[PDB]
Amino acid sequence: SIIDQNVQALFNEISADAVFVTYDGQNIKKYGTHLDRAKTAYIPASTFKIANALIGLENHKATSTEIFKWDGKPRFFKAWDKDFTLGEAMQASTVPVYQELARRIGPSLMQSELQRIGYGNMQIGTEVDQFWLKGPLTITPIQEVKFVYDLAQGQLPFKPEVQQQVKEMLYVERRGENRLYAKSGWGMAVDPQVGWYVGFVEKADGQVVAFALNMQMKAGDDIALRKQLSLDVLDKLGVFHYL
Ligand SMILES: *C(=O)[C@H]([C@@H](C)O)[C@@]1(C)CC(S[C@@H]2CN[C@H](C(=O)N(C)C)C2)=C(C(=O)O)N1
Structure with missing residues (x-):
């Protein structure tokens, strides 16, 4: 309709190839400048932190209260040179913390868990703290959006309390009663x-x-x-109106 047109007109000033996928539990919708991106697999990069935290908490490798201490080695962002809980490192996107969690999980468990939940192509290669940063793990935008939809509903194959804790690590802001997680x-x-x-x-x-x-x-x-x-x-879209 006109909302589709308004949405499209946004992308028609973005020079980069982009896709935007929505999912309401019934319908996938696709917007943007290159719709085939929605079916194409890319590395998850830092969005893998969602599955990393779930796997770590589910398998008693971390708690959401535990402090990941800085080891004194200057990190890429100087805002990373500090101690973090998993939720704090999620919102700061502190890669070293989530690399440390992946090393605690181990390649054997990380692999079987990724196969168990069917995340992307479920490939980890031989470096347990790099596979979401350099490949070989890839995931399509439709897979990602269906992944976080199930997170929101607590319907992922993880303990309910684990899903709730990771979910709220993603909380960004609320407008009225609508909550944004990202x-x-x-x-x-x-x-x-x-x-x-x-x-x-x-x-x-x-x-x-x-x-x-x-x-x-x-x-x-x-x-x-x-x-x-x-x-x-x-x-x-009228999904999350401005204030
Ligand atoms: C996650 O996907 C990504 C990597 C490190 O896992 C992360 C956390 C970094 C960034 S922004 C990035 C840092 N500084 C860069 C820059 O422009 N220069 C040249 C210094 C950009 C993000 C992000 O999603 O914004 N994620």
Whole structure:
């Protein structure tokens, strides 16, 4: 309709190849400049933290209260040179913390868990703390959006309390009773570079609309555009109106 047109007109100023997928538990909808991106597999990059935390908590490798202490070695972002809980590292997207969690899980368990939940192509290669950053693990935007939709509903094959704890690690903001949850990603090690913004809007009436922005990134791109574009789309859709 006109909302589709308003949504499309947003992407018609973005030069990068982009797709935006929505899922309400019944219907996949696709918007953007390159719709075949929705069916194409990319590395999850930092959106893998969602499955990493779930796997770690489910298998008693971490708790949501435990402090991952900094080891004194200066990290890429200086905002990372500190101690973190998993939720704190999620919202700061502190890769070293989630690499430490992956090493605690181990390649054997990480592999069987990824096969057990059917996450992307379920490939980890031989480096348990790099597979979501450099490959070989890949996932399509439709897989991502169906993944976080099930998270929102607590219907993933994990303990209910584990799903709840990881879910609230993703909480961004609320407007009225509508809640936004989201995780961004920028995979820089692979060619082309892939940018993510995945999440879901939950309304008070139990209803969930999950979403996945997926677009090509290049060095020098605006770090805030992924979230900005996504919030604009959700506003034109009337899923998450601006205040
Ligand atoms: C996650 O996908 C990604 C990597 C490190 O796992 C992460 C956490 C980094 C970024 S932004 C990135 C850091 N500084 C870059 C830059 O522009 N330069 C040149 C310094 C951009 C993100 C993100 O999603 O924004 N995720």
